[PDB]
Design a protein around this ligand. Structure first.
Ligand SMILES: *[C@@H]1O[C@H](CO)[C@@H](O[C@@H]2O[C@H](CO)[C@@H](O[C@@H]3O[C@H](CO[C@H]4O[C@H](CO)[C@@H](O)[C@H](O[C@H]5O[C@H](CO)[C@@H](O)[C@H](O)[C@@H]5O)[C@@H]4O)[C@@H](O)[C@H](O[C@H]4O[C@H](CO)[C@@H](O)[C@H](O)[C@@H]4O)[C@@H]3O)[C@H](O)[C@H]2NC(C)=O)[C@H](O)[C@H]1NC(C)=O
Ligand SMILES: *[C@@H]1O[C@H](CO)[C@@H](O[C@@H]2O[C@H](CO)[C@@H](O)[C@H](O)[C@H]2NC(C)=O)[C@H](O)[C@H]1NC(C)=O
Ligand SMILES: *[C@@H]1O[C@H](CO)[C@@H](O)[C@H](O)[C@H]1NC(C)=O
Length: 323
C-alpha cells in the first residue's frame, strides 16, 4: 500500500469513537492536538470500513467522522439531546478539528502530499428523514448544494497540503431496511423514523432513491469537471468510489459476499422505535448486510474496505480516477 496515513470525514458509517468523545465531554470536540479514544465496536457492530482499510494497509487512521453527521449544518442540521447541540457536521466541526490538528507534529509527525489519503463518506443523514427527505433543510437549499458542500470539504483539505482524495458516493438508501417497505424486510416505525408507517413509505423510498442516484451522478461529473477542466485542485488526484454499485452487487448476489444466512433485506440488531428493547438475530453477523436498519454490518464494511484499497491503487471496477 502506497500510503502511511488515512484521514477520514463522514458519519456513523465511518465513526470509530468521535461522537462518544462529544457525549463524554458535554458536546465539546477533542482539544486540538488530541484525538478521541478509538473503539473497535462501531455502528457496524465491529470495525468501520476505515479501520479495516487502515489495518490492511498498515496505515495510521485519523478518523474525524462523527455519528449523526451531515456535510454542513448551514445546509441542514439535527439536534442531539445528549450533547445539547446539533450533531457535528463536516464543514462546521470535523474540518476545523483537522485544520488545527495538522499543526501538531505529535499527531502528524510526517504528513506529505504523497503519503496521506483523505476520504469523505457523507450523505446518508443529509438525504434522509429529518433532513432533506422531510424538507427540513435551510429553506431554498437543494441536494445540488449538498454536492457543492462535498467539493468544499476537498477545498479545505487541499489548502492544508493534501492531494490524494477519495469521495465515497451514496449507498442505495431505498434498500436500507429503514427506507424499504415492510413487505421487502423494511422496518415498521423505527428508532430512526418513529412515524414511518404514518407516511407514504413507497413515495419516500422512491424519493430517497431519486436523491441518492442524482447526488451520485452530480458527484462523478462534478469531480471530473472540477479536477480535470477547472483545475480546482492543482496536482491533486480525485477518486470517486462507486459504493452504490458495490452495495447493489452485494444485495443482488449475497452468497458471493456474506456467510449464511446471506441476508440483505433484514438487519441483525432489531430494536423497538424507542431504541429499546433490542433482540439480535440468530447466526453470524457475517451473514447480514445490515447491522441495524440504517448501518451496514462489519462484514459489509470489510468489503467496502477491500474495494477502497483497490480504488486507491487505481485498479477497481468501482473507482474512477480524475486529475
Ligand atoms: C404512495 O406513493 C406511491 C409512489 O409514488 C404512489 O404510487 C404510484 O401511483 C401512481 C398513480 O398515481 C402509479 O402510476 C400508475 O401505475 C399504473 C401501473 O403501472 C406502473 O407499474 C407497472 C408494473 O410494474 C409498470 O410496468 C408501469 O410502467 C409502464 O407504464 C407506464 C405508464 O404510466 C410508463 O411510464 C412506463 O414507461 C411503462 O411503460 C408503471 O410503472 C399505471 O397503469 C397507471 O396509468 C395511468 O396513468 C398513466 C400515466 O403515467 C396513463 O398512461 C394511464 O392512462 C393511466 O391514467 C399509472 O402510471 C405508480 O405506478 C405508483 N408507483 C409506485 C412506485 O408504486 C401511491 O399512489 C401513493 N399513495 C398515496 C395514498 O399517496
Ligand atoms: C463482526 O463482528 C462480530 C461480532 O463481534 C464478529 O463475530 C463474532 O466473532 C467471534 C469470534 O469469531 C465469535 O465468537 C462470535 O460468536 C461472533 N459473533 C457474531 C455476532 O457473529 C465477526 O467476526 C465480525 N466480522 C468481521 C468481518 O470483522
Ligand atoms: C443547552 O444549550 C442552550 C443553548 O446554547 C443553553 O442556553 C442551555 O443553557 C443548555 N441547556 C442545558 C440543559 O444544558
Amino acid at each position: 500500500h502506497n500510503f502511511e496515513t488515512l484521514v477520514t470525514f463522514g458519519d456513523a458509517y465511518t465513526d470509530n469513537g468521535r461522537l462518544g468523545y462529544y457525549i463524554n465531554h458535554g458536546g465539546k470536540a477533542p482539544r486540538p492536538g488530541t484525538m478521541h479514544d478509538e473503539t473497535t465496536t462501531t455502528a457496524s457492530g465491529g470495525l468501520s470500513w476505515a479501520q479495516f482499510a487502515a489495518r490492511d494497509a498498515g496505515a495510521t487512521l485519523m478518523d474525524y467522522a462523527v455519528s449523526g453527521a451531515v456535510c454542513s449544518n448551514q445546509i441542514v442540521s439535527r439536534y442531539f439531546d445528549l450533547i445539547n447541540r446539533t450533531f457535528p457536521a463536516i464543514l462546521d466541526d470535523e474540518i476545523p478539528s483537522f485544520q488545527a490538528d495538522v499543526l501538531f507534529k505529535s499527531l502528524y509527525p510526517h504528513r506529505t502530499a504523497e503519503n496521506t489519503v483523505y476520504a469523505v463518506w457523507i450523505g446518508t443523514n443529509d438525504l434522509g428523514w429529518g433532513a432533506f427527505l422531510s424538507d427540513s433543510q435551510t429553506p431554498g437549499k437543494t441536494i445540488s448544494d449538498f454536492v457543492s458542500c462535498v467539493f468544499s470539504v476537498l477545498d479545505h483539505v487541499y489548502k492544508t497540503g493534501g492531494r490524494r482524495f477519495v469521495i465515497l458516493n451514496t449507498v442505495p438508501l431505498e434498500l436500507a431496511p429503514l427506507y424499504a417497505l415492510p413487505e421487502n424486510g423494511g422496518t415498521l416505525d423505527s428508532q430512526y423514523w418513529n412515524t414511518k408507517t404514518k407516511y407514504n413509505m413507497t413515495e419516500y423510498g422512491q424519493k430517497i432513491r431519486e436523491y441518492s442516484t442524482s447526488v451520485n451522478t452530480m458527484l462523478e461529473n462534478g469531480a471530473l469537471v472540477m479536477a480535470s477542466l477547472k483545475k480546482r485542485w492543482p496536482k491533486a488526484m480525485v477518486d470517486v468510489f462507486d459504493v452504490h454499485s458495490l452495495f447493489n452487487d452485494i444485495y443482488n448476489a449475497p452468497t458471493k459476499y456474506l456467510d449464511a444466512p446471506h441476508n440483505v433485506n433484514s438487519y441483525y440488531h432489531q430494536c423497538g422505535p424507542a431504541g429499546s428493547p433490542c433482540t439480535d438475530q440468530p447466526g453470524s453477523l457475517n451473514g447480514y448486510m445490515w447491522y441495524d436498519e440504517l448501518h451496514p454490518s462489519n462484514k459489509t464494511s470489510s468489503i467496502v474496505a477491500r474495494n477502497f484499497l483497490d480504488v486507491v491503487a487505481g485498479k477497481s471496477k468501482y473507482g474512477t480516477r480524475f486529475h
